[PDB]
A paper describes a structure:
Eight dog (Canis familiaris) allergens are included in the World Health Organization and International Union of Immunological Societies Allergen Nomenclature database, among which Can f 1 is a major allergen (Pomés et al., 2018; Schou et al., 1991). Lipocalins share low sequence identity but have conserved structural motifs, characterized by an N‐terminal 310 helix, a C‐terminal α helix, and a central calyx formed by two antiparallel β‐sheets that enclose a central hydrophobic cavity forming a β‐barrel for ligand binding (Dartt, 2011).
The hIgE mAb bound to two partially overlapping epitopes and recognized two different Can f 1 conformations. The hIgE mAb 12F3 showed an unusual mode of binding by protruding its heavy chain CDR3 inside the Can f 1 calyx. Very interestingly, 12F3 recognizes a Can f 1 conformation in which a shift of the N‐terminus residues away from blocking the opening of the β‐barrel allows the 12F3 HCDR‐3 to access and interact with residues located inside the β‐barrel. Only when complexed with 12F3 does the N‐terminus of rCan f 1 have a different conformation. In contrast, the complex rCan f 1‐12F3 Fab proved to be an exception in that the unique IgE epitope was located inside the β‐barrel of Can f 1. This type of allergen‐antibody interaction has not been reported before.
Numbering used by the authors:
A (entry chain A): 1 to 137, 142 to 224
B (entry chain C): 11 to 153
C (entry chain B): 1 to 213
The structure:
């Protein structure tokens, strides 16, 4: 039956406000709790607050009290979360959920939205600069590519155009203080093949239609 | 997958004087059934006799509203503004005569004064002016 | 507000073994706890609600129990897809609906010591007037590792970021990258760049270094 459909993704500049929406297709949230949860990249689920009809009040977590506003419009069957004074640490995924808690005992048929990604940064679409992690100078050797200073995500790194997949380790991106992401891809290879085989990393940033292929050889 | 919940019957009142009063009550056990229905089981100690009660509640279009005894009785089980408490209000025919009943259900057996006062107000608003009886809880009943 | 504590934070079990996760509450929460699963980079999925009841389509393996303060999720026998993060949450008509920090169920394997590698910055990047020095820890278990940067034996702090891979599907190991970021000027002030790694699998810290030029 009931379906929660959130507003789309948003890239917001520090100091700004974002208001995410949550359209309930079918049913109403006049009896069911409507909550908002968020998840800082690579961290845990944080309950932000919600509408609690049984107490006839909207309640917020102490961590968010005052920066966040949760409203609902019964005519549009929609609910909103407005976060104020955004900082880089409000970069996260925001969910809305209607909880099946009204009945004294039910089937637990909760409904979650798809989630809204909000990225806080002053950066515009820039493709990465690719720098070599040059191998060191019969055993294993390590090389890689530093993919640095790009917005937005995502970036694809492949090696030798998909040819090298074994021993490859592309790390997660890290949003830096610059508001720009950086990432590293590395690979272990036999030392003997440093003379014979060339290693090229293929960095692809679709947002900026950037394709860089960087060859990684010993430095001089 | 026997979906369920354990509740305590903490207080009760009615419109028609029914001096017959339990001395003790067991946990009320709710079980979800097929066809959307909901079963409640409880045991009541009266005069050293264990009365075993089972009621089947059929769910309606309206949430929190159930029919019982084959449509002849209407039961509303709605959450109280007080935490982990529900108010049951049942109007209709029982054994031929009209009676209305109210029950406070709770997760903790320990009486909550906040919840009792709300339950009082509910009762008084509906006109269940008779005395509200708090019930003592025991895990099992035997002769 | 009420606090849900999930301990342990990581559980290392072999596939097919039983898993027992805990979620202790600061106060008494009466059968109002839900359990969620979250696979990497995916949305949370409801498993259990009202402490003990399983949601629709949830395999029998998953069982919840407990009342008051102490609650338990039991996976009778872990399947391969059950390795993930589980969260407990207060789920009720009445706030607050706070979450636990979560418990990550991971694949158990033998200790493996990290292979350390240090990379100097490129001549190309140094033009930008910044420098990235990278330390790679490769294919190690368990995840707990410590990296210390040393520039001319001077312990660095606050100028590095770490990033870690997910458990390998084949090795079941982790790898980790530490990037020390500094100005070309600061970089060219010093000679010895070093990277000291402490890990369970190492009887003594491992240091890898280069001399600029």
């Amino acid at each position: 039956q009931v379906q929660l459909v959130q507003s789309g993704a948003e890239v917001q500049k520090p100091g700004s406000s974002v208001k995410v929406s949550c359209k309930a297709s079918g049913g109403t949230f006049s009896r069911y709790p409507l909550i908002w949860v968020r998840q800082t990249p690579g961290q845990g689920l944080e309950w932000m607050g919600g509408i609690f009809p049984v107490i006839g009040r909207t309640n917020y977590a102490e961590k968010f009290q005052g920066r966040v506003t949760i409203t609902a419009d019964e005519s549009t069957s929609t609910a909103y979360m407005e976060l104020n004074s955004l900082t880089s640490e409000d970069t996260a995924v925001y969910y809305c959920a209607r909880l099946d808690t009204y009945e004294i005992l039910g089937y637990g048929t909760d409904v979650w939205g798809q989630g809204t990604t909000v990225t806080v940064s002053s950066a515009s679409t820039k493709g990465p600069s690719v720098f070599p992690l040059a191998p060191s100078s019969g055993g294993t050797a390590a090389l890689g590519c530093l993919v640095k200073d790009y917005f937005p995500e995502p970036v694809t790194v492949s090696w030798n155009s998909g040819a090298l997949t074994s021993g490859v380790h592309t790390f997660p991106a890290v949003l830096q203080s610059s508001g720009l992401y950086s990432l590293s891809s590395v690979v272990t290879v036999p030392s003997s093949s440093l003379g014979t085989q060339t290693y090229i990393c293929n960095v692809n940033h679709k947002p900026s239609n950037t394709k860089v292929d960087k060859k990684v050889e010993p430095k001089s | 997958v026997a979906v369920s919940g354990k509740w305590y019957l903490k207080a009760m009142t009615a419109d028609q004087e029914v001096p017959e009063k339990p001395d003790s009550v067991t946990p009320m056990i709710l079980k979800a059934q097929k066809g959307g229905n909901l079963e409640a089981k409880i045991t009541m100690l009266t005069n050293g006799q264990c009365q075993n009660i089972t009621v089947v509640l059929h769910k309606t279009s309206e949430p929190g509203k159930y029919t019982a005894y084959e449509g002849q009785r209407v039961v509303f089980i709605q959450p109280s503004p007080v935490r982990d408490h529900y108010i049951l209000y049942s109007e209709g025919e029982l054994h031929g005569r009209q009676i209305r009943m109210a029950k406070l259900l709770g997760r903790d057996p320990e009486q909550s004064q906040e919840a009792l006062e709300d339950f009082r107000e509910f009762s008084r608003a509906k006109g269940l002016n008779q005395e509200i009886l708090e019930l003592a809880q025991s895990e099992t009943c035997s002769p | 507000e009420i606090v849900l504590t999930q301990s342990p934070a990581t559980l290392s079990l072999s596939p097919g073994e039983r898993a027992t996760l805990s979620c202790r509450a600061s106060e008494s929460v009466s059968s109002s706890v839900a359990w969620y699963q979250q696979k990497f980079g995916q949305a949370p999925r409801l498993l259990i609600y009202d402490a003990s009841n399983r949601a629709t389509g949830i395999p029998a393996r998953f069982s919840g129990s407990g009342s008051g303060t102490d609650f338990t999720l039991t996976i009778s026998s872990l399947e391969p897809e059950d390795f993930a993060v589980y969260y407990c949450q207060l789920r009720s008509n009445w706030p607050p609906l706070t979450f636990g920090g979560g418990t990550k169920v991971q694949i158990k394997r033998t200790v493996a010591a990290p292979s350390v590698f240090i990379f100097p910055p490129s001549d190309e990047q140094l033009k930008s007037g910044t420098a990235s020095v990278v330390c790679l820890l490769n294919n190690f278990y368990p995840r707990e590792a410590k990296v210390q940067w040393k520039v001319d034996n001077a312990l660095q702090s606050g100028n590095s970021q770490e990033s870690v891979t997910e458990q390998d599907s084949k090795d079941s190991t982790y790898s980790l990258s530490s990037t020390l970021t500094l100005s070309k000027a600061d970089y060219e002030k010093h000679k010895v760049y070093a990277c000291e790694v402490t890990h369970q699998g190492l009887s003594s810290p491992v240091t890898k270094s280069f001399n600029r030029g």
